[PDB]
């Protein structure tokens, strides 16, 4: 039994001003490097503890001992995501209900049904790049977000955002991004009292109304037509929870749609961006990956079966998730009084934060080379210890979208590597923008077509 280290303090603000930065996760990563596997973090009326070691995170991941907590970031996202899967407590009736209805829609099996629609968007990405002139470059995060948003639109609700036809966002996305922006900015802030932030508050209320009206219309216009298009919206309108026997009500369905639209703008787009970054910075790896893409994707249109064969492309994506897990933290609470790691006594209710990028750098798991991009670490998936690798979180509150994310990222990265050579023509310096998620800002490449017909 021993006392926790704590980073530097600002009198009565405690540690809060440490979050007065547009890169809080990165600042928390540098604090973990200084203080080690566990530190205390206090704000006025709040105390959490950041975990960085596999030794302590394997205990936090014990579902008999700890459950999902909504962090301050999750409570602010709930103002527009409501009791959707990502922002609901495990004990809220709508969590288990929604989880049991949607779990079949997100299985490895359901991916065979989404495949055609994903390919439709991936082919739009490849044609865009095939049609660039010699002088031009690729804005990598911008194009990946166009792809992932369009993919979740079409598979989710049979809606085309047509992001490859635009350089200005949909009225929904403007509100959605501006809501999320306001939600992360609030973390550091003084209070919800300053008249200054009323304008930020006014705007936030108009954005919640805009997202709510446009998604409530979508539900309404789909119940209008009676059409049964095999999409998440159909599954949610017809689907019945086997426990309660009930379907979701229209309000919860609107919350699920908002939740899914954010995920598929903010997470998979980041994975693909990091993955391409590590590939252009590691030529030997790009070469192994492009060899597999060219051998496997022998048809102009990739099949489900062919994407499952891209083992090494899978390993690249897992290595990108290891260094830069795009949803970098999740929050837990003690269900009862308990002792963490034989050393840190917690009371019932006490909060933990899992710093996933730090977990993924634990030299006692991964060796001394933790900063190296080596997809070969993942050649043998049973060599990875339990709870050493948690990019999709933990237990029943893990990412429902995991197989959807990996199928889309494997398909698209497969096709990119099949169709183009890539040049890091600016020698890009990694600059990680923090929203809810991580993305590489300003990441630009050139592609040189291999002139393979679609
Ligand atoms: C590479 C992409 C993604 C990563 C790294 C990721 C990561 C995560 C993680 C770490 C959690 C746990 C959060 C927590 O404990 O607070 C989570 C939950 C969730 N994710 Fe994802 N995600 C990704 C893509 C997606 C996609 C594409 C969707 C939807 C189509 C999605 C939907 C969700 C939902 C609904 C939850 C809450 C599930 C529940 O608790 O019942 N995610 N994700
Ligand atoms: O939101 C929190 O409670 C903490 C930050 C905090 C604020 C006030 C007092 C004490 C701690 N959040 C976090 O540690 C991290 C860093 C910034 C975002 N974040 C987070 O966990 O956001 C929720 C989230 C959403 C989506 C994906 C991962 C994580
Ligand atoms: C990280 C998680 N997959 C997420 C879910 C919904 C909205 C934003 C993020």
Please state the three-class secondary structure of the chain as a single string. Answer: CCCCCCCCCCHHHCCHHHHCCCCHHHHHHHHHHHHCCEEEEEECCEEEEEECCHHHHHHHCCCCCEEECCCHHHHHHHHHHCCCHHHCCCCCHHHHHHHHHHHHHHCCCCHHHHHHHHHHHHHHHHHHHHCCCCCCCEEHHHHHHHHHHHHHHHHHHCCCCCHHHCCCCCHHHHHHHHHHHHHHHCCCCCCCCCHHHHHHHHHHHHHHHHHHHHHHHHHHHHHHHCCCCCCHHHHHHHCCCCCCCCCCCHHHHHHHHHHHHHHHHHCHHHHHHHHHHHHHCCHHHHHHHHHHHHHHCCCCCCCHHHHHCCHHHHHHHHHHHHHCCCCCEEEEEECCCEEECCCEEECCCCEEEEEHHHHCCCHHHHCCCCCCCCHHHHCCHHHCCCCCCCCCCCHHHCCCCHHHHHHHHHHHHHHHHHHEEEECCCCCCCCEEECCCEEECCCEEEEEECCCCC
Residue-wise over 93-105: b if at least 16 C-beta within 10 A, else e?
ebbbbbbebbeeb
Which residue has a Cα nearest atom 5 of ligand 3? 263
- Residue whose CB lies within 8 A of the most ligand 1 atoms, among 401, 402, 412, 413, for a mutation test: 401
Which residue has a Cα nearest atom 9 of ligand 3? 263
Residues 6+ apart with CB under 8 A from 418: 290, 293, 294, 297, 450, 452
Residue 288 CB–ligand 1 contact under 6 Å = no
Interatomic CA distance for residues 134 and 136, integer angstroms: 6
Q: Are strands 329-334 and 351-355 parallel, antiparallel or unpaired?
A: antiparallel
Residue 157 CB–ligand 1 contact under 6 Å = no
- Kindly tell me the sign of the dihedral angle through the C-alpha atoms of 417, 161, 210, 232: negative
Residue 401 CB–ligand 1 contact under 6 Å = yes
CA of 32 to the centre of ligand 2 (A): 15
Residues 6+ apart with CB under 8 A from 440: 140, 141, 270, 273, 274, 277, 428, 430, 431, 432, 433
Q: Rg of the Cα trace of the chain?
A: 22
Burial of 202 by CB count in 10 Å (0-12 exposed, 13-18 middle, 19+ buried)?
exposed
Q: Which of 145, 267, 268, 410 is catalytic?
A: 267
392 is catalytic: yes
CA of 329 to the centre of ligand 2 (A): 7
Q: What are phi and psi of 352, to 5 degrees?
A: -115, 150
Residues 6+ apart with CB under 8 A from 381: none
CA of 402 to the centre of ligand 1 (A): 7
* Method in brief: X-ray
Measured from the Cα of 327, ligand 3's closest atom is: 1
Residue-wise over 128-152: b if at least 16 C-beta within 10 A, else e?
ebeeeeeeeebebbebbbbbbbbbb
CA of 450 to the centre of ligand 2 (A): 43
Which residue has a Cα nearest atom 12 of ligand 1? 393
399 is catalytic: yes
Residue 74 CB–ligand 3 contact under 6 Å = no
CA of 393 to the centre of ligand 1 (A): 8
Question: Is 344 a known ligand-binding residue?
Answer: no
CA of 240 to the centre of ligand 2 (A): 33
Q: Are strands 351-355 and 338-340 parallel, antiparallel or unpaired?
A: unpaired
Measured from the Cα of 106, ligand 1's closest atom is: 30
Which residue has a Cα nearest atom 22 of ligand 1? 399
Interatomic CA distance for residues 313 and 351, integer angstroms: 37
| 364, 312 Cβ separation under 8 angstroms | no
Question: Is 114 a known ligand-binding residue?
Answer: no
Q: Which of 66, 106, 278, 392 is catalytic?
A: 392
Residues 6+ apart with CB under 8 A from 362: 52, 53, 54, 370, 388
Lining residues, ligand 2, CB within 6 Å? 19, 24-25, 41, 43, 46, 48, 71-74, 187, 327-329, 353, 436-437
């Amino acid at each position: 039994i021993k006392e926790m280290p704590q980073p530097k303090t600002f009198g009565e603000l405690k540690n809060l001003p440490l979050l007065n930065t547009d890169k809080p996760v990165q600042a928390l990563m540098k604090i973990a490097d200084e203080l080690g596997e566990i530190f205390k973090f206090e704000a006025p009326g709040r105390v959490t503890r950041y975990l960085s070691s596999q030794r302590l995170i394997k205990e936090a991941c014990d579902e008999s001992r700890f459950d999902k907590n909504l962090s301050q970031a999750l409570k602010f996202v709930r103002d527009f995501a409501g009791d959707g899967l990502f922002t609901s407590w495990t004990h809220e009736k709508n969590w288990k209900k929604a989880h049991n209805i949607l779990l079949p829609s997100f299985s490895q099996q359901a991916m065979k049904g989404y495949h055609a629609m994903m390919v439709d968007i991936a082919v739009q990405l490849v044609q865009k790049w095939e049609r660039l002139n010699a002088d031009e470059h690729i804005e990598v995060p911008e194009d990946m977000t166009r792809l992932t948003l369009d993919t979740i639109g079409l598979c989710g609700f049979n809606y085309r955002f047509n992001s490859f036809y635009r350089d200005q966002p949909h009225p929904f996305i403007t509100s959605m991004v501006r809501a999320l922006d306001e939600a992360m900015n609030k973390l550091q802030r003084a209070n919800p009292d300053d008249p200054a932030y009323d304008e930020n508050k006014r705007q936030f209320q108009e954005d919640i109304k805009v997202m709510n009206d446009l998604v409530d219309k979508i539900i309404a216009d789909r119940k209008a037509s009676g059409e049964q298009s095999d999409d998440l919206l159909t599954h949610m309108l017809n689907g019945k929870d086997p426990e309660t026997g009930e379907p979701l009500d229209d309000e919860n369905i609107r919350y699920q749609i908002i939740t899914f639209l954010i995920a598929g703008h903010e997470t998979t787009s980041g994975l693909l961006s990091f993955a391409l970054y590590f590939l252009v910075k590691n030529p030997h790896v790009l070469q192994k990956a492009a060899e597999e893409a060219a051998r496997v994707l022998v048809d102009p249109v990739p099949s489900y079966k062919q994407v499952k064969q891209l083992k090494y492309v899978g390993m690249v994506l897992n290595e990108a998730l290891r260094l830069w897990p795009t949803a970098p933290a999740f929050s837990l609470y003690a269900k009862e009084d308990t002792v963490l790691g034989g050393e840190y006594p917690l009371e019932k209710g006490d909060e933990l934060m899992v710093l996933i990028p730090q977990l993924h750098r634990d030299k006692t798991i991964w060796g001394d080379d933790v900063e190296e991009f080596r997809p070969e670490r993942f050649e043998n998936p049973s060599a990875i210890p339990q709870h050493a690798f948690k990019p999709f979180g933990n237990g029943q509150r893990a990412c429902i979208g995991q197989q959807f994310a990996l199928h889309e990222a494997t398909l698209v990265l497969g096709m990119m590597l099949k169709h183009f050579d890539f040049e890091d023509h600016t020698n890009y310096e990694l600059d990680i923008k923090e929203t809810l998620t991580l993305k590489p800002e300003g990441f630009v490449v050139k592609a040189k077509s291999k002139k393979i017909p679609l």
